[PDB]
């Protein structure tokens, strides 16, 4: 049973995307997202998330999300 390292930590990831909205525009979408990993689920995260998963995976997620919100005309 070798130790697994996660550092299950809430980081304030400053995210910046120029995405306009439904229309085109230079909109500096600054989202400082304070976020953790799913400590309530299961150890397999180590294979996928491992360490420094915050800036690893979550800044891609936030880009998809801000598109589903901002790029749909919200801004």
């Amino acid at each position: 049973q070798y130790p697994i390292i996660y550092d299950i930590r809430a980081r304030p990831r400053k995210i910046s995307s120029p995405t306009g909205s439904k229309d085109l525009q230079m909109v500096n979408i600054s989202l400082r997202v304070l976020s953790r990993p799913n400590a309530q689920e299961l150890p397999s995260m180590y294979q996928r998330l491992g360490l420094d998963y915050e800036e690893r995976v979550l800044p891609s997620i936030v880009n998809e999300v801000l598109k589903s919100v901002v790029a749909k005309f919200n801004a």
Binding site: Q1, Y2, P3, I4, P43, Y46, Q47
Partner: peptide, 30 residues
């Protein structure tokens, strides 16, 4: 020492696939 020379990288979540010097990548779950 032998913990990783004689024994594979058997640490939780890790895998160490057999590259056979004389046959190539032994595509085996090991």
């Amino acid at each position: 020492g032998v913990v990783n020379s004689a024994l594979y990288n058997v640490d939780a979540g890790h895998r160490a696939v057999i590259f056979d010097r004389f046959r190539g990548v032994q595509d085996i779950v090991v």
